[PDB]
Amino acid sequence: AQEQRMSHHYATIEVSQQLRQLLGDQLVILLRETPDGQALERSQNDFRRVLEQGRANTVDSAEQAALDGVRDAYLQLQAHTPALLEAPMADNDGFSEAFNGLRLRLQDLQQLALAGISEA
Amino acid sequence: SNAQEQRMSHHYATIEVSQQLRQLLGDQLVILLRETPDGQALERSQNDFRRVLEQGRANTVDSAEQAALDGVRDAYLQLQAHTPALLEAPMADNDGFSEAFNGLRLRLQDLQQLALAGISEAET
């Protein structure tokens, strides 16, 4: 029974990693000199998709409720996003690219450590 | 046995370093997304990120994880090099996006901690 709780919790961990990556993707776009609204649209649709997939197959009350909380907060973020497109945030892509570089390395470090735990 | 337990401890430790660094990076973004970023708050957050990172570089037993942290260090110095532009020419019109981003990233951090706990427990 411990292993069955395990694979379920790992799926949830993967959902949370995908959502964090997608939020990161959106921030990278929004921080560019000239954000691409269609890229932003795709990334938002992707976030909602991963969240809904996750909500539909999580069979654990605490994690269902956490996902509901993520949805609630995400809808608010989405509502404030157009004001960032309408008026860009940077004079060049410097910060966006530096941010992207760092956050990818941090994501990779977490995944590397998670791996060390799995195969053990 | 005992060995494996020590290894788990090591990996979970790196997970926590990475969680802390991600939270601290998020703190800096929350500040920079504000209409009037507080430079002093940002400096304190930068100092904390460096401290956590440097302790991690010194204390991380797994060789691959330690190497990864050098990569994080390199990328962080690049982020710092590009930070004054956003600090000194803030272009956000209000705090809406910043506050909403903070709310969301905290809920995501909560989701991840909850999932990790489930893995931790099922691993015993």
From TrEMBL, chain A:
<protein>
    <recommendedName>
        <fullName>histidine kinase</fullName>
    </recommendedName>
</protein>
